[PDB]
């Protein structure tokens, strides 16, 4: 969740590898936006009785609520598609299992997650922790030895018009925003935030809970920002300014780490293998959070209750189908399945407004929210974000079609 999701990796790394440091601003303005939007959901969770799905359902009739539920469920399926592609690529790099077979393997990683469960949570998550830290150390090493120009990075943080001019920078930009502001984290946070310690009617107990939840929500989002910048700089350092126009996917990073001159041959192979294991670990951890979010969305909109293993199997089954169809059409082209990997996050950008608007409506309401209320500052910046985001989505959809 955040810096572990493969969508952030592919969008940031391809943004840097294809358009230099330009999209850095899109990483910042989105990472800030999330910090605000999450902070609203937190309040919506703690101030009002229950989470976002129940509120949106409460303000809508059953048909339109079913439509919203279709949009949200499709977003969850999109993230699942992202980590399905991630795990498939990892199994192709480590064990040589083709993508069409690995995608089929990703249906039973629940079983495999039980097998890991038998080995204890703390130990395996510590192994994955040292793995992620080691891989990040490799990336910091690559950026450090690339001799980057700091003034060009800080120049990259400055916005440019070209971000909306051509379809490429705008496409990767929508992918970055959709990957950093995941719509399912709003429904998830708006309910998991209500498990803290406070009396439902005593109010500074609540404001204390929102103080904490907001502080944490900004901490991990800060880390996700830093990691996203480190990855965009990684792809920009390895594949930008190249005569062959390497798009900068997971395979390009794999062979770039494996053929790095100073990094050696066997050592570089160790680095690349660790990166692949970190990609599989990236594809294994998002599933539980996706399952809880799907429970909140389904029980909130449709008021239907099914077990978490069942909806996990259903969401995974629906997620593998477009991956398999993509692999059959393009004959297992890795660059194409990575293009699908980006398109999933772009679809998250498409699905963002349907979750942002009811959040604004419920948060601005005086009766529902009471003392905790959207300061008109929040209403201004938030309505600005909804307007400009929906405008960018409609603009891209109309331009491409």
């Amino acid at each position: 969740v955040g810096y572990m999701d493969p969508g952030n990796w592919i969008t940031s790394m391809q943004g840097g590898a294809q358009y230099g440091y330009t999209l850095l601003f899109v990483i910042l303005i989105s990472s800030l936006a999330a910090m605000l939007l999450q902070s609203m959901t937190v309040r919506l969770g703690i101030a009002t009785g229950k989470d976002l799905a129940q509120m949106t359902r409460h303000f809508l009739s059953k048909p339109v609520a079913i439509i919203f539920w279709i949009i949200a469920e499709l977003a969850i399926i999109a993230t699942d598609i992202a980590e399905v592609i991630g795990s498939a690529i990892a199994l192709d790099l480590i064990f040589g299992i083709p993508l069409i077979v690995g995608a089929l393997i990703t249906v039973f990683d629940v079983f495999l997650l039980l097998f890991i469960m038998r080995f204890g949570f703390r130990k395996i998550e510590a192994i994955v922790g040292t793995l992620i830290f080691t891989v990040l150390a490799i990336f910091v090493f690559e950026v450090f030895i690339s001799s980057p120009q700091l003034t060009d990075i800080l120049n990259g943080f400055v916005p440019h018009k070209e971000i909306v001019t051509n379809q490429g920078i705008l496409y990767i930009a929508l992918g970055i925003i959709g990957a950093t502001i995941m719509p399912h984290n709003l429904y998830l946070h708006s309910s998991i935030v209500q498990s803290r310690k406070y009396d439902r009617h005593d109010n500074e107990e609540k404001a204390q809970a929102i103080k904490y939840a907001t502080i944490d929500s900004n901490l991990q989002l800060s880390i996700a920002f830093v990691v996203n910048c480190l990855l965009l700089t990684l792809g920009a350092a390895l594949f930008f300014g190249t005569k062959t126009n390497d798009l900068g996917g997971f395979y390009d990073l794999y062979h770039a780490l494996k053929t790095e001159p100073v990094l050696g041959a066997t050592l570089g192979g160790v680095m690349s293998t660790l990166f692949a294991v970190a990609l599989l670990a990236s594809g294994q951890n998002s599933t539980i959070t996706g399952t809880l979010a799907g429970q909140i969305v389904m029980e909130g909109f449709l008021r239907l209750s099914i077990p978490n293993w069942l909806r996990r199997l259903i969401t995974r089954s629906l997620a593998v189908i477009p991956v398999i169809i993509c692999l059959i059409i393009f004959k297992g082209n890795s660059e194409k399945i990575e293009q699908l990997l980006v398109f999933s996050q772009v679809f998250l950008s498409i699905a963002l407004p349907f979750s942002l608007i009811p959040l604004q409506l419920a948060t601005s309401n005086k009766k529902l929210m009471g003392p905790f209320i959207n300061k008109t500052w929040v209403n201004i910046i938030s309505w600005t974000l909804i307007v400009i985001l929906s405008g960018l989505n409609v603009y891209l959809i109309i331009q491409t079609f």
Partner: nanobody, 120 residues
Framework: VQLQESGGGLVQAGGSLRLSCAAS????????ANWYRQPPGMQRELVAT???????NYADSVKGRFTISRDRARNTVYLQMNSLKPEDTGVYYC???????????????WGQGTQVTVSS
């Protein structure tokens, strides 16, 4: 860095083989690949061609039966030869444009051909 071929050998008409074209050391990318062959007493004939974007083309004598492909995880160009005929017998060569690192210029490489014999 040398281009190494494998997967050839002896097979009966109707069977299948799979040629493997790899490199001696770790490579970043094989941008373009061509599978040539030479039958006894005939000229060197271009059989398969795969490009950077993944598109491929085959000779009319081999189209529909042969399939060149790129394994990107291992940087290995494969030639899947199905429904083999006795005239497919010959020495198969692999020509490939290897890119040692990311920013190195793409270089041309050939390789010692492998023997393919379709008997009876």
């Amino acid at each position: 860095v040398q281009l190494q071929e494998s997967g050839g050998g002896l097979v009966q008409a109707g069977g299948s083989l799979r040629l493997s074209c790899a490199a001696s050391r770790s490579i970043f990318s094989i941008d373009t690949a061509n599978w040539y062959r030479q039958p006894p007493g005939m000229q060197r004939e271009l059989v398969a061609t795969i490009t950077r974007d993944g598109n491929a083309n085959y000779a009319d004598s081999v189209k529909g039966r042969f399939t060149i492909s790129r394994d990107r995880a291992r940087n290995t160009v494969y030639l899947q030869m199905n429904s083999l005929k006795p005239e497919d017998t010959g020495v198969y060569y692999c020509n490939a444009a290897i890119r040692t690192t990311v920013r190195t210029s793409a270089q041309e490489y050939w390789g010692q051909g492998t023997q393919v014999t379709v008997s009876s």
